Amino acid sequence: AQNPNCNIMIFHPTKEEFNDFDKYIAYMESQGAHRAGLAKIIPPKEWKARETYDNISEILIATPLQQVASGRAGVFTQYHKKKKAMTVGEYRHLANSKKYQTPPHQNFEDLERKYWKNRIYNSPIYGADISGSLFDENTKQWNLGHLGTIQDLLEKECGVVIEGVNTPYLYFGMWKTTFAWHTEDMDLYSINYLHLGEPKTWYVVPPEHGQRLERLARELFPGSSRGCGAFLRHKVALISPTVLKENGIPFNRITQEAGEFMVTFPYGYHAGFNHGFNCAEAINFATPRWIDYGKMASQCSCGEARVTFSMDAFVRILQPERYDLWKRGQD
């Protein structure tokens, strides 16, 4: 068995190997990358996402989200308070202000220490979940707006044609902006490209150990667990690495820098934080290996998780028994 300790693997494809996205994902899996839940892909030196980032300031962040924490420093939830619209240039200036800017630090480990000590005492503002793309249309390799769609994969594997579309999303971050512990919708893959700015630190639980994280979360968030049998789908709970280690939960960590891709694998729980002003692009995708994970994915039906249009068909076809209850949650 390849990668039996479930380490995060880092890949350096050549420009030739960067042509065929599906083939490269399957290669990485042949080497055991999926066992970690997360892999890094450093693009060949010949590649670029676009020519420059000098002209992005007028992108609008219609609904910036202030991430307000409750709990203790290593075990907390966050809620998203909606703020007034602002441009990317306005958000960048805000990120760099004395109130929000990255503190002085020695290295990524020192900054990570400071994040976990102090996150809860601040409420950073995240420009998350913005439909759009920063890939040039002429970028032919690993262009996250030109991937094969999940609806087409389902149709190719299973023969059933379904409605829905699959487009990318932009994330503009600042120091301390946080992504809570989650798997993707329908336990899909994700791919995330850090276009510019400061790093993103990731934590990940191997898919084979995801239920250990779920059991800890039920213990640590006992009201939420009574409310919903899949409350991590709400994407609000944070647990620090120190607390994970105290509770014996297997996990790994890695820091993504600008110009690098991360892939999350089906049922790989992940969480993390941004180091300072940055911009990432991410999208979900599927492969043949995903289908069995999609059929088994948990679902929130309490009403909180509320998701895209395109998840309907995935539930309907892969999980027909659960469909009626889940759809009630959506309505």
Ligand X SMILES: O=C(O)CNC(=O)C(=O)O
Minimum Å gap between C-beta 88 and Mg ion is: 7
Among Mg ion, Ni ion, ligand X, none, what binds residue 192 when CB lies within 5 to 8 Å by partner kind? Answer: ligand X
241-300 residues near Zn ion, rule: CB under 5 A? 300
Q: Which of 179, 231, 277, 285 binds ligand X (CB under 6 A)?
A: 179
By CB under 5 A, residue 302 contacts Zn ion: yes
Residue 235 region by backbone torsions, left for phi larger than 0, else alpha for psi between -120 and 50, else beta = left
Contacts of 217 (CB under 8 A, 6+ apart): 181, 225, 231, 232, 237, 239
By CB under 6 A, residue 280 contacts ligand X: yes
By CB under 5 A, residue 315 contacts Zn ion: no
Among ligand X, Ni ion, Zn ion, none, what binds residue 280 when CB lies within 5 to 8 Å by partner kind? Answer: ligand X
- Burial call 57-92: b when 16+ CB within 10 Å, e when fewer: eebebeebbebebeeebbbbbbebeebeebebeebb
Distances (CA, A) of 20 to 74, 150, 196: 41, 17, 24
> Residue 68 in 3-state DSSP?
strand
269 annotated to bind ligand: no
Q: Which of 54, 58, 321, 331 binds Mg ion (CB under 5 A)?
A: 58
By CB under 6 A, residue 264 contacts ligand X: yes
Minimum Å gap between C-beta 198 and ligand X is: 12
184 annotated to bind ligand: yes
The Cα–Cα gap between 120 and 122 comes to 6
| Residue 105 or 289 with smaller CB distance to Ni ion | 289
> Residue 175 in 3-state DSSP?
coil
234 annotated to bind ligand: yes
Minimum Å gap between C-beta 223 and Zn ion is: 12
200 annotated to bind ligand: yes
By CB under 6 A, residue 171 contacts ligand X: yes
What the block records as the tokens of 229 is: 């049998």
By CB under 5 A, residue 152 contacts Zn ion: no
Question: Backbone phi, then psi, for 233, in 5-degree steps?
Answer: -65, -15
By CB under 6 A, residue 282 contacts ligand X: yes
Question: Backbone phi, then psi, for 285, in 5-degree steps?
Answer: -150, 170
Place of tokens 């213990």: 219
Is-contact 171 88, C-beta < 8 A? Answer: no
Among Mg ion, ligand X, Zn ion, none, what binds residue 58 when CB lies within 5 to 8 Å by partner kind? Answer: Mg ion
126 annotated to bind ligand: yes
Is-contact 30 261, C-beta < 8 A? Answer: no
| Residue 178 or 190 with smaller CB distance to Ni ion | 190
Residues interacting with Mg ion, by CB under 5 A?
56, 58-59
Kindly list the residues in this chain that would bind ligand X in the complex (CB under 6 A): 171, 179, 190, 192, 264, 270, 280, 282
Residues that bind Zn ion (CB under 5 A): 228, 300, 302, 304
